[PDB]
Design a protein around this ligand. Sequence first.
Ligand SMILES: CCc1ccccc1-c1ccc(CNCCc2nc3cc(C)ccc3[nH]2)cc1Cl
Length: 327
Amino acid sequence: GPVPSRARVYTDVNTHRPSEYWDYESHVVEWGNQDDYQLVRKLGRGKYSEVFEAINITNNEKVVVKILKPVAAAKIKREIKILENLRGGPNIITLADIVKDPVSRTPALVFEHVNNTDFKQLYQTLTDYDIRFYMYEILKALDYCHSMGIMHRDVKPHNVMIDHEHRKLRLIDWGLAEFYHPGQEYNVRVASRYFKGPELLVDYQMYDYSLDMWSLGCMLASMIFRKEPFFHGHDNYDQLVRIAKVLGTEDLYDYIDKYNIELDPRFNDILGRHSRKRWERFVHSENQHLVSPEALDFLDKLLRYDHQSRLTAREAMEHPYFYTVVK
Ligand SMILES: CCc1ccccc1-c1ccc(CNCCc2nc3cc(C)ccc3[nH]2)cc1Cl
């Protein structure tokens, strides 16, 4: 069978905190007044929720209301427990209230409002300095939630709100987040395709916080190399082939052999043989201003098949790539 794995950091957090901390099923939800919030406009719909711009009439403040679809309503206690546990943490979205939506009859989470700068404007105009700045702000959020025994499991640009005018960042959508328990086998059907770690793609369930570090590396590669997403798989299988065309097949086989993982035989006719590519291939006159030896070294230390070998969030914070960032 597969070789067990455990995180190299924060393994003991959930065993040394009381059962009340991680046992989200036992937690009792206190409901607020749904008529305190007037819905203004729908911002989006996903498979687990609908998100609205709203106004809190008890203070006159803009808020975001997320109304959970009945499918996600089953695992609301987990999201609420994670949001309450992390509330006040650096760059974590603040849960302001929880109400019962009168239409869906499902829980509706009320969050602080972030005046989000359009994704395209950010993706097209952030400087080398700003990219480093915002990556460092994401690292604060990830080190915080990992230090609190939580993995996000859905790190991606869509889940990072940036108010560029106020240089304010928030990591949102904690709906796929989970408490990390060493030895626990987790669902690999997490994160979005382009950001899924090789551990998920090869069906290795004993993963940990380091999955978030791979997703972060995917975001960095996309930004500095101007390819969004960086690893653009047609499906979960082709997603691993796309990675292997850059990082090579040899380190992939060393990875699966280390953990005694048996690859799905469907990979035999699609994976091929690929050498690891040097990053200069992805550097052109247009994006050279975003690329530096420090950016490449930092990326090399995130985008590793072996989840145990990746930089942790705290280690990533002292990488030379952030020396130019005002602290
Ligand atoms: C290429 C990704 C990346 C790499 C390195 C540094 C930063 C970023 C980044 C990170 C986040 C964003 C902005 N993302 C907006 C996502 C978003 N999701 C929302 C959801 C709601 C309900 C409202 C506004 C929302 N805005 C833009 C960018 Cl460019």
